[PDB]
Every structure is written in structure tokens, then in C-alpha cells.
RNA sequence: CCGGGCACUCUAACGGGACUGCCCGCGAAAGCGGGAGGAAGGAGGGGACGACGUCUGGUCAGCAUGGCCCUUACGGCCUGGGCGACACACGUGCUACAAUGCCCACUACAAAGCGAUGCCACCCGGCAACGGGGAGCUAAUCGCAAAAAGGUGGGCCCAGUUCGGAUUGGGGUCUGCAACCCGACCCCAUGAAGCCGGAAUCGCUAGUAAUCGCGGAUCAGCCAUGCCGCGGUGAAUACG
């Protein structure tokens, strides 16, 4: 059901579903799922409410997840760029912070491609 | 008593020893089928006895080192013709037509400079 | 995701010079070429001129500047 | 794919060890 | 292969990893093959001169 | 129960020097199980064939360590008499242990 | 082959039916030189093609390829400043040649989820006439044919 | 851009190493580099021997260092002293105490290297290119010497322009294995410049 | 594995073998077509090997070298930075866009190579990188080591997903005086573009293409997806 903020996952398998839980990646999904003593291969619309109840409790609090992560990790950006650090800078410009090239490639970074004259 | 043959195919060699019996081959200790099985060209390795006719005359023991299975299945398939021919020589008029006895000379062609496979360039643009 | 290892490094040039200063006060500034040289909390609330290849520049540090290296406070390349 | 790193075959294409895949 | 950078042999590099080879016969600095202590180039000389012991033409 | 090793770049030498020591511990000796080839322990060095670019020409190099094996059989005393130093060969190196 | 002729290959039999035309079907199914998946692909095909059509599926295939096989096609060629799509024959082996190669493809554009299925469903789809093979088929003949005035480029 | 070296083409057959010993990976650079100081040291010494090769043994701390030589009348000296010399400027270089040996070449004219030295030292006294070529080349042929060629480089005559002086006789097979063909090579130094020159001797074949 | 033995496999020196030699047909001959025997035929397969010369081709920055020029600096030492800059454009490549697939578990066959201030079996700690301990190996005898695709079983069920792993936050390991500029590797979280690619354009004719892993040189470490090699599986097509 809903599990550790708004978000619900159904209709497949218990891990594959937390993996829709934004702190929760497949391999905290399976930690979870083994010390709450659940059965990985079991649909979510066949969890018993015990087992959701089980689950919730465990996932919420252990691990700092959804909207508490995303915050703290621009409070993290936030606070690189304002010590004024190399790295802020690089956020800051939009570019490669973890020191690739950028005379071609790191389109990801830069988004879509602008074109000028040559 | 016993017929021994070799055989070889790209870069594996098999033992054979033809002893009379019941017709059940044993490789490397293990059961034909146990070392086979999964792969489909595998009973062409016994191809040689179906041709003669012999199949559960002789059983088989085999051992084989060198290359892949495949390559395996054909040095089998070599040296049975060859215990076969050590066997009966007449049998050799019989085998030839189909060439079991023909070593396969086709080996992996070595790699060359300034390309990338031995063969294959690489590509350019020239705009 | 950045790493060290135990026994962390600080250049002795200025580790020494930093608690020199300290003992008997605040003084002025510094002029520093290692870059390399983590920055530690008995460094906060001085001022340190960092070589960028070209010049020295005066960077404050705070408490929330430590463990970084200097050079990152120092950029070397001048863009646009 | 050969590009994962958390992946048998990521590790294997990038030719290290670890969680994903071990010494035995 | 300028004639300071032959400083390159020092017993007190300052720093281990401060070492580097170099060509034993040209300086050469990159491209130096450890087993002979020369540079390719000295290398393919020396081959074809026949002044490296044991070392032939291959060919497979 | 003496082992011997034979290193050489040149298997011509090996093998004459070899051969040799054979013939020297026969008579003096055991019937010399004689020498076993070993595998030959190969060295390649690929070399750009010219000074500056031109990345496709090459021409590489191989440098082939071949071995040889002798261990007599009956380590009589009378044997290191025709053993011990007799030989031609420069470039073949011997390796005694017990 | 500017010089010789270019003899053809010749294939090693099928190790079940002992027909050459399967061998070749297992080739053109075969992707990436994996054999033995693709031998597995078409077995498990055949054996697909029973207890829905009650014959032997080694009939089904062959009469599929039969009907997959084109008697004319058309070509290119540059005449007087132009360039024509001129109709003509086609050779017995690049009728099979193209048979097969149309069959893999069009089973490979087909919905069913796994190869075998897909293999299958092709092959009895154009062994009874209809199915993108057969469509291909349809559509080069009805090309060639459709440039009948051109017919005298035949060269 | 084409012709490998012919010394280096027949390094198996038909030719053998001038340094001729074995040692490990460990060994091999030093043994090499100490062999390189001694042609060095040799090839700036005994020149005006004309020697045409310097052949290197080694056991175990002990180097033969055979010299062929065109005249050992030079190498020897006065009642052999120049020898002693040589041995001690030897052991001062390598401390592993070794000797050393002269042999004569016979007919200076058939070993490529002399031949290409004797064109050089034409060439540095301002002889004419052409005739010097032809000249060598025939002097190498009137002696056995089933084959013979000799190539000058650019800058003949001082030109400002760069040019190659060709002139050669008899069979000259490059890309016959078994051919057997003596190669040499001498620079010249002169006030316009450096002239390459290279000598090819064929002697019988099998 | 022990005794035991060189028959086989292998290892590495030498040698045999194939020459249109034999048969039919065509041909003046050279030779061509086919057939036999043969492991192999008509150059059996692959290397090395590249004529007279051409491009005033490339390189004085590998080396050598004529001339010219600088000789309190156009030499020399060091710290630091730069060669890694980024609105952009091209070349070469890597990984992909998935079910002939991805993941997990068990399980099977290789060649060529490297290894003593080295490879590191095995034991312990650690999720792991790795750390501690430590056997063997001057190495056909020990180690790198696991080959991978493959097979068996199980999961996924057509979705931008159990496809794809860019990007970014955090915590670490090792090398190294030192990882800020600017290393690689591990673990957690993040989970981008990408649904087979416009005009145009590239390679390859058989153990080739395609695909799968493995090693090595340089090297403290490594930006190696590069290069040079090795073996596994193994196609299509050539009218002309
Ligand atoms: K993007
Ligand atoms: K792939
Ligand atoms: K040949
Ligand atoms: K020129
Ligand atoms: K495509
Ligand atoms: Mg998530
Ligand atoms: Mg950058
Ligand atoms: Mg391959
Ligand atoms: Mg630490
Ligand atoms: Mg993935
Ligand atoms: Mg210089
Ligand atoms: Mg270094
Ligand atoms: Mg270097
Ligand atoms: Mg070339
Ligand atoms: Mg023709
Ligand atoms: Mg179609
Ligand atoms: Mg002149
Ligand atoms: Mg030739
Ligand atoms: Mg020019
Ligand atoms: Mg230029
Ligand atoms: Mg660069
Ligand atoms: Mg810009
Ligand atoms: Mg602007
Ligand atoms: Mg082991
Ligand atoms: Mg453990
Ligand atoms: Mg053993
Ligand atoms: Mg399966
Ligand atoms: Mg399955
Ligand atoms: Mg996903
Ligand atoms: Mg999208
Ligand atoms: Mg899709
Ligand atoms: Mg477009
Ligand atoms: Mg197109
Ligand atoms: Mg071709
Ligand atoms: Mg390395
Ligand atoms: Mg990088
Ligand atoms: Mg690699
Ligand atoms: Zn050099």
C-alpha cells in the first residue's frame, strides 16, 4: 500500500515495487524486504496488511527517504556553492562537477545542444 | 580387442578407444550426453558408426582437451573414423566419400597490424 | 563520494605557521603555494592567500569550509 | 548492460571484483 | 632529448615517483622498453644491426 | 638425481651441448634419460617502424628462450669426471641443483 | 566474382531431417554466429507446428518456402539518361535465397512474443498463402510485371 | 620508404649476431648497454684500422671481444703495447677484467663496411662522387664478389639540391633469403653537410 | 594421488610429404576442365618480404646534421598552474535502445602470455574495494585463474521496465610526498538521453564477417572503451 510518503506501487513483485520509493533502490529493497521477514516474489496486492504494516515501519525510519533526501541534497548543493568551492562553481555554470571533459561530450550536463557560426 | 584413433579440429584433440560392447560412450568420464546435450550438432560426433552401420557394436572411450565443444564434437567425430579404419581398412572405401577422415585445416587466421580483426579495417571518413 | 584515507595530509609549511599565529593571536594573511593541504578547523577565521599558478588570492575560511583542500577556493582557469 | 557497474557482466567488461562479483 | 633532462638518472630524485627512464642510448623519454633500457626507435636500429642477442624477425 | 637446466636463445647450441653431456655421462654412467624439450618461453616487442607518426607500419620483434631438461640417472662420481667442464657452447647457460 | 564463376556452398545436412534447406533456414535464423540457440529456435518451431497442423512440419516448410518463392523481380539499369526498374527471371538458388530471407524477416515483424512461435506462425501462415512473406512475394511480382514495357531492357 | 636491413633480414640464416651471449631479464639491459660503450669506445678508437666488425661473447664475467680488423698492424701497435692499452681502457670502463682478440680481414674490399668507409673518406677529401661509386664498386667485383652495389646520398658535389648516385653491378638479390649479403654503412661529414653512403657485397648463395 | 610405464596427448629439435607425379578428355606447347589415391592438391591457409621511381610527401621534437639566430638569457634549478579550458563543428571508438533479451544460482570446454622490492594459493575481518596473516613458485611442477558467450533451473512479461547506466549527492579502499584543479576502484542513493538513427557513408568473400571472453607491452597509480596479440561460436552472398 502507501509506503513511506505519497507514493504507492502495485501489481508486481514486493522489492521491484519499493524500488518506486525514491531512498530505496533495488538493494535496500531487498535488505527490507529480508529483515522484514516478507517474501520478495509476492505480488503487492497479495501483501498482508501485517506484512505492510512490518514494511512500513522498517523502510520509514531507517533510512532518510523521498522528500527529506531531496532536500538534503540540495541543502548539499546549496551549501557547496555558497563556501564559494570549485565544485559550487561547477554546479553553479551547469557543468561537469566530477572533472570530465568538456571540449565535446557532457551534453547530459549542458542539456540540448546550441549551435553558433564557425 | 581394442582400435585407437586421434582426430583433430581447431586446436582440440580427442582420444578414441573402440572396445566391442553394448554401444555406450563415455567422454572424460563423464556420459556422452552429460558432456553434450544443449548442444544439437553433438550426435554429428558419432556420425561415423551410423555410416558403417555399427553404432551399439562398439562402446567408446574418449578423452578431449583443446578448444570448445564444438570443435571437440568434430575431433571425436575424426578420430571414431580413424579407430574405424584400424578396425576394418576396408572401411576406409566406405568412409571416404563423406570425408570423415579429412582433417578440418581451418584455424583461427591470426590478427594483423593496422586493423582490427585480421581482416576487418578500420573505417574512414575522408569528410 | 571523494576520498584519502586515515592519517589525513596537511602540508607542516603552513600546519606550523597556522598554530604559530595562533599562540599569539590573529596577525594578517599568509601566502601559501600548496594547494594540496586540507583545510582544518584550527585554520577557521584566518585568511589565506592561495596560488592559483598566477597570483595569490585572500580566502576567508569558516567552519564549514574545513576538509576541503585550498586549491578549491582558488580556481586556476579564467572563463568568459 | 557491459556499462553497469553493479552488474556480473559490468564488472567482468570493466574486469574488477566485488559485491556483484565475487572471488568465491 | 635535451642534455638536462639527462639529470633524469639521479640517486636523489627527492622522490620515488619523481624517477622516470628514459633512452639509454638517444634519451628518447617515451616509448622505452624496460627489458633493453632503449626506446623503440634505437630498438628497431640495434634489432636490424644484430647487436641484440637472440632477438629476430617474427613471423606466424 | 641431479637436476640440470638448459637456457639458451640458440636450440642449436642447446641441443649439441645437450647431446653432449649425454654422451659424457653414458659412458661413465647410467643410461642418461636424455634431454626433454620443455616449452620455449617467447618475447615480443611490436615497434612502430618509423620515427615520427604513421601508426600502421610495425613490424614487430620475437626474442625465444628455449630449454632443455638431462637429469642422469646413478649420480656416479666417474660421471663428473667427462661432466664438470667440458664444452664449446658461449651463449648456453647451465643450471646445476641436487 | 570478377574473375571466377563463384561456385556455391554447399551446406552440411540437417542433423534431424537430413535436408540442407533446413541447415539453411537454421543460418538465416541464426544471429550473432550463435547455432545452437538458433537450432533450438526452429526445432521448438516444428515442434509448434504439430498438434496445430497434424502433419509433418518438415511438409510445411518446404511448401512454405515453395510458396515464398518469386518468379520475377526487378532491377535497375541506366539507360540514355535515365534509370529504369526493369522486370526479369529469377535464378532457382536466389528464389530460395530470398524465400528464406523474407521468411525470417517477416517472422521476426510478427507480434507473437518468442522466437519459436513466431517461426512457427510464419511459416504455417505462408505455407497455407498469407503472411508478410508471402505479401513481399505478392508485391515484387506484382512490381516486375508492373514494368512489363521495360521488359526489352533485359540484358 | 621500403627495404628493411638486409643484416637485420637474414638474422637467422645467412647471418649472426655480432653479440652473441644469454642472460635473464634482470641481466640482459646492463650486458647490453656495457656492449654498446665497448663498440663505442672501439669504433672511436681503432677507425684508422679500418675495422668491419667488432664480434661480443660473455660466460660468466668474462667478454671475448673479437675485432676484425683490415690492418691489425694499427691495433697492435709497437711491439704489442697498443693492445695493453686498449685491454686497460677495457677494464676501466667494465670492471669484469676480460680479453680481447685481432682478426684480419682478408680482402678489406669484399666487408661492406670498409667499402663504405673507404667512399666516405673519398668523399670528405672532395673526390668525385660518380667515379668514387664506380671505382668501389669495381674494386669490389675484380675480387670474387658475385655481386656488388654502393649508394651515395644527397648533396653530391655540395648541391644545394639533394641527390642519389646509383651505379652498381653484378647480382644484388635483396629478397633472397639464402643470398647471403655483406651491408654497410659510412656517414660523411663535410662543410655543406652529412652524405649517407651504403655498400652491398653478394657473395655466393647457399 | 602412490607404485609403475613412453603407447597416446602434449612439449621442441630433426625429417618425410605434393611434383599436374598417375587416369580420361581439349591443346602445337605452356597449360585448362574433370577423376583417382591422399591429411592436403593445381599458389593447401596465413605471415615476413614491397622493383626503377613518384608525391620539393613526413620527421631538424628520437638520433645525427650544414646554415642562421640567443648566450645575466631563446641556457639552467624549483613551487604552482597549463597540456584536462567550452557557445560550438568533425574523425575514431565504447555502451546501448532489449525477450534470438536482462538478472540470479549451479555447472562445462581454450589459446597465447606475464610473474621476487613480483604473481599472490589458502585462513581471518570486511556487503565490497581492500586490510591482516601466510604456503608455493628462480616457475610444462606455484600463482595470475574466473574464460565468456554455452548448458540446466528459476525470476522478469513488452513497460522506458528487473531495458539502458549518463548525471549527481554521500560514505569509503588503494597507489602515491601529495588525487582541488586532475587517478582508478568499492558500497548506498540518484536512474538522464536513448524505441535502431536525415542527406550521406564504412568494413568484410570463410574459419572470413558477426559475436564472446583472455593476455601483454607502457606503468607507482591510471583516465585502456586505445593498441598489439590469443583462443571460443560461427554465418550470408558473388548473376555478372
Ligand atoms: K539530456
Ligand atoms: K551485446
Ligand atoms: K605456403
Ligand atoms: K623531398
Ligand atoms: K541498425
Ligand atoms: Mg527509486
Ligand atoms: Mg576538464
Ligand atoms: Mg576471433
Ligand atoms: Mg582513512
Ligand atoms: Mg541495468
Ligand atoms: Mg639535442
Ligand atoms: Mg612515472
Ligand atoms: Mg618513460
Ligand atoms: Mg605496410
Ligand atoms: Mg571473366
Ligand atoms: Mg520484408
Ligand atoms: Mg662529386
Ligand atoms: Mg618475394
Ligand atoms: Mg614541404
Ligand atoms: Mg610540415
Ligand atoms: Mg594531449
Ligand atoms: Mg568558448
Ligand atoms: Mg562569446
Ligand atoms: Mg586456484
Ligand atoms: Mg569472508
Ligand atoms: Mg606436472
Ligand atoms: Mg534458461
Ligand atoms: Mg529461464
Ligand atoms: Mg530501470
Ligand atoms: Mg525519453
Ligand atoms: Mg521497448
Ligand atoms: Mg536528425
Ligand atoms: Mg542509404
Ligand atoms: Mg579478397
Ligand atoms: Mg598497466
Ligand atoms: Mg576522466
Ligand atoms: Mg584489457
Ligand atoms: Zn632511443
Known amino acids: 500500500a502507501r509506503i513511506a510518503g505519497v507514493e504507492i506501487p502495485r501489481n508486481k513483485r514486493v522489492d521491484v515495487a519499493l524500488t518506486y520509493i525514491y531512498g530505496i533502490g533495488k538493494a535496500r529493497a531487498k535488505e527490507a524486504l529480508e529483515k522484514t521477514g516478507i517474501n520478495p516474489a509476492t505480488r503487492v496486492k497479495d501483501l498482508t496488511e501485517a506484512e505492510v504494516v512490518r514494511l512500513r515501519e522498517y523502510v520509514e525510519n531507517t533510512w532518510k527517504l523521498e522528500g527529506e533526501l ?44 546550441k549551435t553558433v557560426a564557425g | 580387442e581394442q582400435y585407437y584413433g586421434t582426430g583433430r579440429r581447431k586446436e582440440a584433440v580427442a582420444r578414441v578407444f573402440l572396445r566391442p560392447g553394448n554401444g555406450k560412450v563415455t567422454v572424460n568420464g563423464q556420459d556422452f550426453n552429460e558432456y553434450f546435450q544443449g548442444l544439437v550438432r553433438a550426435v554429428a560426433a558419432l556420425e561415423p558408426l551410423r555410416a558403417v552401420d555399427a553404432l551399439g557394436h562398439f562402446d567408446a572411450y574418449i578423452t578431449v582437451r583443446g578448444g570448445g565443444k ?36 581451418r584455424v583461427v587466421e591470426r590478427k594483423k597490424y593496422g586493423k582490427h580483426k585480421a581482416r576487418r579495417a578500420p573505417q574512414y571518413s575522408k569528410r | 563520494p571523494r576520498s584519502l584515507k586515515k592519517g589525513v595530509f596537511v602540508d607542516d609549511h603552513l600546519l606550523e605557521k597556522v598554530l604559530e599565529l595562533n599562540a599569539k593571536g590573529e596577525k594578517r594573511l599568509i601566502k601559501t603555494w600548496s594547494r594540496r593541504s586540507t583545510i582544518v578547523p584550527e585554520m577557521v577565521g584566518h585568511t589565506i592567500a592561495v596560488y592559483n599558478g598566477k597570483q595569490h588570492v585572500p580566502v576567508y575560511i569558516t567552519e564549514n569550509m574545513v576538509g576541503h583542500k585550498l586549491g578549491e577556493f582558488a580556481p586556476t582557469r579564467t572563463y568568459r | 548492460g557491459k556499462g553497469d557497474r553493479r552488474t556480473r557482466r559490468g564488472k567482468i567488461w570493466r574486469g574488477t571484483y566485488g559485491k556483484y562479483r565475487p572471488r568465491k | 632529448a635535451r642534455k638536462a633532462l639527462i639529470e633524469k638518472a639521479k640517486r636523489t630524485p627527492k622522490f620515488k615517483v619523481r624517477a622516470y627512464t628514459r633512452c639509454v642510448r638517444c634519451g628518447r623519454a617515451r616509448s622505452v622498453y624496460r627489458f633493453f633500457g632503449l626506446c623503440r626507435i634505437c630498438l628497431r636500429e640495434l634489432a636490424h644491426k644484430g647487436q641484440l642477442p637472440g632477438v629476430r624477425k617474427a613471423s606466424w | 638425481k641431479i637436476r640440470i637446466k638448459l637456457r639458451g636463445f640458440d636450440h642449436k647450441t642447446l641441443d649439441a651441448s645437450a647431446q653432449k653431456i649425454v654422451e659424457a655421462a653414458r659412458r661413465s654412467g647410467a643410461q642418461v634419460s636424455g634431454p626433454i624439450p620443455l616449452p620455449t618461453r617467447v618475447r615480443r616487442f611490436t615497434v612502430i617502424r618509423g620515427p615520427f607518426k604513421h601508426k600502421d607500419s610495425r613490424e614487430h620483434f620475437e626474442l625465444r628462450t628455449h630449454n632443455r631438461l638431462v637429469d642422469i640417472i646413478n649420480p656416479n662420481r666417474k660421471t663428473i669426471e667427462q661432466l664438470m667442464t667440458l664444452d664449446l657452447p658461449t651463449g648456453v647457460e647451465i643450471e646445476i641443483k641436487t | 566474382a570478377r574473375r571466377r564463376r563463384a561456385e556455391v556452398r554447399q551446406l552440411q545436412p540437417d542433423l534431424v531431417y537430413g535436408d540442407v534447406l533446413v541447415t539453411a533456414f537454421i543460418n ?39 510458396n515464398v518463392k518469386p518468379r520475377m523481380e526487378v532491377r535497375s539499369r541506366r539507360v540514355g539518361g535515365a534509370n529504369y526498374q526493369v522486370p526479369m527471371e529469377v535464378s532457382p538458388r536466389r528464389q530460395q535465397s530470398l524465400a528464406l530471407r523474407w521468411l525470417v524477416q517477416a517472422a521476426n515483424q510478427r507480434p507473437e512474443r518468442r522466437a519459436a512461435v513466431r517461426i512457427a506462425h510464419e511459416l504455417m501462415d505462408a505455407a497455407e498463402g498469407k503472411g508478410g512473406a508471402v505479401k513481399k512475394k505478392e508485391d515484387v511480382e506484382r512490381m516486375a510485371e508492373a514494368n512489363r514495357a521495360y521488359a526489352h531492357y533485359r540484358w | 620508404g621500403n627495404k628493411i636491413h638486409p643484416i637485420g633480414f637474414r638474422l637467422g640464416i645467412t647471418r649472426d649476431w655480432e653479440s652473441r651471449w644469454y642472460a635473464g631479464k634482470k641481466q640482459y639491459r646492463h650486458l647490453l648497454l656495457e656492449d654498446q660503450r665497448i663498440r663505442g669506445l672501439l669504433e672511436k678508437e681503432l677507425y684508422s684500422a679500418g675495422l668491419a666488425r667488432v664480434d661480443i661473447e660473455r660466460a660468466a664475467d668474462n667478454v671475448a671481444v673479437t675485432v676484425h680488423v683490415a690492418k691489425p698492424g694499427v691495433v697492435i701497435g709497437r711491439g704489442g703495447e697498443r693492445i695493453r692499452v686498449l685491454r686497460e681502457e677495457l677494464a676501466k670502463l667494465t670492471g669484469k677484467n676480460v680479453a680481447l682478440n685481432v682478426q684480419e680481414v682478408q ?14 673518406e673519398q668523399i670528405e677529401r672532395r673526390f668525385a662522387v660518380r667515379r668514387a661509386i664506380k671505382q668501389a664498386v669495381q674494386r669490389v667485383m675484380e675480387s670474387g664478389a658475385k655481386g656488388a652495389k654502393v649508394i651515395v646520398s644527397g648533396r653530391i658535389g655540395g648541391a644545394e639540391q639533394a641527390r642519389t648516385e646509383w651505379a652498381a653491378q653484378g647480382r644484388v638479390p635483396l629478397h633472397t633469403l639464402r643470398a647471403n649479403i655483406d651491408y654497410g654503412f659510412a656517414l660523411a661529414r663535410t662543410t655543406y653537410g652529412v652524405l649517407g653512403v ?8 647457399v
Open chain 1, 70 to 113: 531531496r532536500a538534503e541534497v540540495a541543502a548539499n548543493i546549496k551549501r557547496l556553492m555558497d563556501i564559494g568551492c570549485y565544485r559550487g562553481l561547477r554546479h553553479r555554470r551547469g557543468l561537469p562537477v566530477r572533472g570530465q571533459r568538456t571540449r565535446t561530450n557532457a551534453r547530459t550536463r549542458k542539456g540540448p545542444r
Open chain 2, 70 to 105: 564444438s570443435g571437440q564434437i568434430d575431433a571425436i567425430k575424426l578420430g571414431i573414423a580413424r579407430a574405424l579404419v584400424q578396425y576394418n581398412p576396408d572401411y576406409r572405401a566406405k568412409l571416404k566419400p563423406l570425408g570423415f577422415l579429412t582433417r578440418d585445416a
Open chain 8, 198 to 205: 651504403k655498400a652491398y657485397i653478394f657473395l655466393g648463395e
Open chain 7, 28 to 66: 538465416k535464423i541464426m544471429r550473432d554466429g550463435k547455432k545452437n540457440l538458433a537450432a533450438r529456435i526452429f526445432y521448438d518451431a516444428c515442434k509448434i507446428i504439430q498438434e496445430k497442423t497434424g502433419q509433418e512440419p518438415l511438409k510445411v516448410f518446404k511448401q512454405a518456402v515453395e
Open chain 8, 107 to 120: 680482402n678489406p674490399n669484399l666487408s661492406a663496411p670498409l667499402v663504405a668507409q673507404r667512399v666516405a
